[PDB]
Design a protein that fits this description.
The structure holds 4 chains of a larger assembly.
Chain A lengths: L9 E4 L5 H10 L2 E4 L6 H8 L4 E4 L7 H5 L6 E4 L9 H6 L3 E3 L6 H17 L1 H9 L17 E5 L3 H12 L3 E5 L11 E2 L3 H7 L2 E4 L13 H5 L5 E5 L8 H9 L3 E6 L22 H5 L4 E3 L8 H20 L25 E8 L4 H8 L5 E8 L3 E8 L4 H12 L4 E7 L1
Parallel strand pairs in A: 1-2, 1-3, 3-4, 4-5, 6-7, 6-9, 7-8, 9-10, 10-11, 11-12
Antiparallel strand pairs in A: 13-15, 13-16, 14-15
Helix pairs in contact in A: 1-12, 5-7
The complex binds nicotinamide-adenine-dinucleotide (4 copies) and hydrogenphosphate ion (4 copies).
Chain lengths: 419, 421, 422, 422
């Protein structure tokens, strides 16, 4: 049904990507160099020269200094959520598409919150520390059944919706405040003001992205705006909660418990003493506080999650390496074609990345005036632009000429022809 | 025309060891004098306060034995706001015609939700990881940390807690299988298993929801563990004897069981203490705490406000229904007897509540006495050496009720008699 | 648990006759407990009926039982109406002679609901009339006033067994459910109980009746009520043949006020199946009724499914077996509802007394005097009018004692029947 | 800051010709159009006169629009078939004049699904026969081989738009769902995809067809296959008039192998409604078929509901509005599917070119030279046959410059239709 291209390139994977990425690459038929740890600037630069696609994680640092030397690279796949460890503006300038999987931790974050809602309601965390050190304190005051309480979801997005149905299944009443009017799922209610959600809610979760409107969204003023004995959970971004204000609020018995998965300063390496007061001045005060579940950014750290993120991003790079499909790139125009589901043979695909200056399409379509262009799609994501064209009857003698003509043009950034 | 005055303060009820307020609402809305205490009272103060009380509501702390109930006259029923009839001398209470009630199934959702939470904590290892960040260590690990969706939960006891656990677990995206000595109509998408071993083979999480029986003691031992999937999880919030704790610590250290969560233990302390959960209680305490992914709780399954509130509602209505209509269904130590309230349309119908010794000829005695009026309904049953009779007699005259009461009170082998009108 | 073994041995032989084609599951239950069963496919005549009855009867509303045919019937224990209604059977006399009557009224609950669901869709899409048309060669493909069921509102009158089951089905199909009932009944699913019947009619597209036959319900949907529901709505009656004023409905349907209707019961129904039964001689409007668009007529088939009949067999056979073997009589129509625990193989030499008497004072004085020699563990009696029923479990009894006890009890004044279990 | 502003006239003109749902008028009027509505299909003469300046014409299954009657249309842009099929369109002609054709093929999913649930329940209970019987005066109250639908199993052949909706509804009524589809499709609810059609037929009590017309589906269910079904099961076909071997079926029902069946589509359906169209002349088997018991016949109405025409209106009007206003041609029957982002009004100096041309080399050389004076932000061209469609967004343009840009593009060789939108 669908034709492939050349198909014999070389990819380097750096920080332990799921084997499902490996199956997709190898079953696609590529050469794959796997590494278990994060490499230093020197060994990486030497290894990137003849590499074609690199799959990095949040630790490996890719900058213009180390990316200047990579001249045979096509696309960079971040098997991550975050993109800031890659110099997007430069990679766009050199015509390299970057891909990621931003919504892969959805079910993994929902299930975590549910467990943290129940554990905080029952103080299960405190109880396990207590029996571990030999103390047995069986109290039932302020221990609740989750059923019949109300859950306030802040940000009704990918994580927010999945959480909302689950909390309904557990028998909680769901309220969500969102800047956008979003069709509520199940029995939830869209609220008009944030104050109404906070006032009426027993549990409050944060599932918003990082914006200045969300920075310290819940601070000491915001905390007091809420139910008499309540709980707060933040598993979005380390700036949404005023942690000094929060430790103040928790010590005053205003918030019954809380569970946090993200902090303002997280360390970059696992260590036996990493989570100390040196990163956060308040760490000792929090640890000495009751019924708080502290976690090291594990919201999306599940086996099932990593397998899904691996498949998705590897499939994305595979489709971009084999077809021109760039949809989902962070720093690139989103461009795609029928990829020849009915097309016959002797058909070439032009993938022309250029600088977005007028007349570029004039030069190119003139170069192509000799053969029929069946489909064409070009879009511009800033200073760089991307063109795809399918020409209908080319011979190996002609394909050579077509490439050099395209290579000699002004504002060529990258040129490829798929056979 | 006839018509009778209100007696307030006629009944006097005593509630000990902090019974939930739903109980006081149920009692006061009916109108009683209720002496509430937040603690368990001393031997002197109790006997002083119990002589003329009419109904006592206690919990597992208050000890009511033959010595303290001997002096108590004009007592009607004892309400254990408990699961167990802990520290009540039932045989003596029955002997003096005292009904004891409790609410054994009020902790069902509170135990189910706990299990659901513990399944998630073990799968994500939230317990060990939250301890680590609390102690300054940072280990963000994702290997053998699973999403619950798509796994299977093996429920060992498909009773009140078992069924409730099942629907919740399916809602979370688990496949549920349950093994039970009884075939039980599956709820929802659950699957009844043929042998326990099939469950052990096929399950990723296994929970225990059985009672304490000789068949259940150390129900999960080393053969059972090896018959479970490589790296599965175990939860027991049923009874402290159901799991072979040494066998389990052996299996987990051998990396055959990934983690487990326990709410009940073989030797739990009888009083709260600052260093109570020590090795003196259980020889394995040091070995257990050392394992990597173990979630331990102090018999907290079901220690929730909603659980206690339901216990109050259930036991307070039960005692109220016994005091007002003689209805004893559900008593722990008593015959279970009950009759249709009354229709109110027919007047001058009295109801006899005759508690007697279970000896032949008594029913001859009573029905002769009642031979003057028509007995529309009658029901008597025997539970031990004691028996209980309730009857509705028709067209009785206020002059006659006193006579019928006096004749009945003078009978042989009557332990307590009461007439409603 | 328990063994729950106990076998009734006073006479030692009983023979029950299940006629008018009772479902085969009723035959299995009776035979498997061990009885003689005389099976008949039809309803018998008075002469053949009176004979064979001396040496349990199962009827099907067709069989006519009056005091006359039961006076001669001796050694009778219980009558099982494998019916919903126990009508044209003389309940009061059978009680007078101490004969318990049983039935199964809620076994057709799922069959009637599924019907209405079926009748809702077809009225909306006019499937019936369209099929008549194609059968005679006419082809009229019209889409006007044919609706999707999803999004409409169903007015359920009476929220009982059928009303309940119908409600979840109506929603699952995507209908909004509104229901009117004289009693406040906790809605199932998303349904809403309405205040006034007039409210229900006003907002409803389909109205079904699922109420019993009472003077309050007779012709309860008449010309005012039809004028109250929305223009073009639909009327369904599968409850009782008196609840709809057919003249009022037929007036409305001719006036294009009501789009269609489906009727499963009528004021005057035939007593036998026939080729020309449904005529004006049976019901004055019958000719005008049939000459109307989109009317679904059915011959009291609401409860006529194989599954319903099998369910009717299991229920009533189980009830008769329980009354015969343990005496549990709960659910009898004309009898006191009395029952006691199983008994047990463990408790040996424990007899059960089943004593039916006239509801007159002093019977228990007489009876309990007789039993004074042995201990009564449990005893229960209740009265359903002039007749009353007593159950007793006696301990430490021997067949030597049992004979005297039956002899003494059979000799009592105003005692009507005596039975022993062993 | 110049902010040049146009005039408002009655120039915008839309023509709706035969039986359009009221939702198109609302969508068109609320968008701000002049709409000429007609209740019937007009003759060639009246049509030609009315189409000359129509920006947009909407026809139905009746209206005949051909190249000859389309020659006169000059200011015409798109033809919207408020249909499932585009049979009377003459697509090649519309393409030649650069006219896009639209339709709504999947609107009838819930209407045909609901019909099936009703027809399943009606066959199970033999409602059609019973209602014919009472109308003809006969009263036959039979329950034998009449079933509750709950607990039986439904076999779905074709799990597409209709099959999927049907599966959920059938489960709601208490059925087990099995489906055979040539493509492995993710089952909905508790359904199971079965491997072979033969597996499906053996275990099923009800069989439904929801497949397209293919040589693989033509006479898909024939006599070998019917004999491969449960003894005394049911057959439903509301897909295509070619999928069932009607003689094979009539054989099986007369052989008491198939208890009943319901058909909505046939090999030879009339093109016009008639009082005698469906005679033996139309289908050789018609007389034998109609004489068979428990068969539900319907005249290709599985999608003839008000809700269906309302949904069709919303869909096709929305599609035409998008082509007129934004150029999005996705879903056209005879046209390339081309679309670009909605164009945030915030950038107020960008033109949109909708350039329809002949699919020959050098066109994009010619065009992008013309547009070379300004930056083309986005561009998208695709080709359907000999015609092609270009959309381009060119930046920082002034009303002064637009005249040239339109003039040059209108002046190009092999330009068939050009439109600029800002
Ligand atoms: N803990 C973890 O390890 C982990 C894992 C995955 C995602 N996350 C974080 O969780 C967050 C949610 O992820 P997602 O996939 O749900 O994103 P999302 O973009 O689908 O949803 C975010 C939602 O928040 C809403 N929103 C934004 N600002 C808001 C505000 N001020 N008030 C109310 N609503 C607001 C947006 O409208 C949007 O619907 C992101 O910040 C993501 O980085 C954390
Ligand atoms: N953790 C807590 O603090 C807490 C609170 C309340 C109840 N519980 C305990 O939980 C247990 C279950 O409570 P419940 O309400 O479900 O009781 P239950 O009587 O409702 O259910 C027990 C079930 O176990 C089944 N069963 C019996 N023996 C079995 C065996 N050997 N193997 C498997 N199944 C067997 C029975 O058939 C029954 O279905 C009890 O022991 C109860 O005291 C614990
Ligand atoms: N078509 C058949 O063959 C067939 C089969 C079975 C049952 N039925 C009939 O259907 C009817 C309903 O049966 P059911 O088992 O649900 O009975 P039901 O007793 O369970 O329910 C009847 C309900 O109607 C309500 N009601 C009574 N009078 C009312 C009034 N005036 N207005 C509104 N609501 C009123 C009652 O409160 C009750 O909830 C019965 O009459 C039954 O005989 C017909
Ligand atoms: N009765 C009516 O008036 C009416 C109305 C609308 C649609 N229909 C017809 O119903 C049919 C289904 O419509 P839809 O919207 O579901 O279409 P669809 O394309 O969504 O679904 C058709 C399904 O059939 C499957 N399939 C195709 N050929 C098959 C074969 N030989 N065997 C098994 N499976 C096969 C396809 O994979 C697909 O799942 C169409 O033919 C349509 O014309 C009839
Ligand atoms: O008491 P009595 O005899 O039953 O009336
Ligand atoms: O008298 P009695 O038998 O013991 O009850
Ligand atoms: O290439 P083309 O010119 O579009 O056809
Ligand atoms: O040529 P351009 O417009 O830049 O794409």
């Amino acid at each position: 049904l669908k034709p492939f291209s050349t198909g014999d390139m070389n990819i380097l994977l750096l920080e332990n990507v799921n084997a499902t990425a490996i199956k997709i690459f190898k079953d696609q038929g590529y050469q794959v160099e796997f590494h278990k740890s994060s490499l230093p600037e020197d060994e990486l630069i030497e290894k990137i020269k003849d590499v074609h696609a690199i799959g990095i994680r949040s630790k490996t640092r890719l900058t213009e200094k180390i990316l200047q030397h990579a001249r045979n690279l096509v696309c960079i796949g971040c098997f991550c959520i975050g993109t800031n460890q890659v110099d997007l503006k430069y990679a766009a300038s050199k015509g390299i598409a970057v891909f990621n999987s931003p919504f892969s931790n959805s079910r993994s974050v929902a299930e975590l919150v549910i467990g943290e809602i129940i554990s905080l309601a029952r103080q299960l965390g405190d109880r396990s520390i207590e029996l571990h050190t030999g103390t047995w304190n069986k109290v039932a005051a302020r221990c609740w059944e989750v059923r019949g309480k109300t859950l306030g979801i802040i940000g009704y997005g990918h994580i927010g919706s999945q959480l909302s149905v689950l909390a309904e299944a557990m028998g909680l009443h769901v309220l969500y405040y969102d800047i956008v009017t979003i069709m509520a799922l199940g029995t939830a209610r869209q609220v008009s003001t944030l104050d109404e959600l906070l006032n009426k809610s027993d549990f409050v979760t944060l599932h918003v992205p990082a914006t200045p409107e969300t920075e310290k969204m819940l601070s000491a003023p915001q905390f007091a705006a809420m139910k008499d004995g309540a709980y707060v959970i933040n598993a979005s971004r380390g700036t949404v909660v005023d942690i000094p204000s929060l430790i103040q609020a928790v010590k005053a018995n205003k918030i019954a418990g809380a569970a946090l998965d993200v902090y303002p300063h997280e360390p970059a390496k696992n260590g036996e003493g990493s989570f100390n007061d040196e990163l956060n001045s308040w760490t000792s005060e929090l640890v000495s506080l009751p019924n708080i579940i502290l976690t090291p950014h594990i919201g999306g750290s599940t086996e099932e999650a990593q397998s899904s993120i691996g498949i998705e991003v590897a499939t994305a790079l595979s489709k971009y390496i084999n077809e021109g499909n760039s949809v989902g790139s962070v720093n690139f125009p989103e461009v795609s074609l029928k990829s020849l589901d009915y097309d016959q043979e002797n058909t070439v695909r032009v993938l022309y990345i250029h600088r977005n200056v007028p007349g570029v399409l004039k030069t190119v379509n003139d170069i192509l005036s000799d053969h029929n262009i069946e489909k064409q799609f070009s879009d511009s994501h800033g200073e760089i632009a991307y063109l795809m064209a399918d020409i209908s009857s080319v011979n190996q003698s002609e394909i050579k000429d077509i490439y050099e003509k395209l290579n000699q043009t002004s504002a060529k950034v990258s040129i490829r022809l798929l056979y």
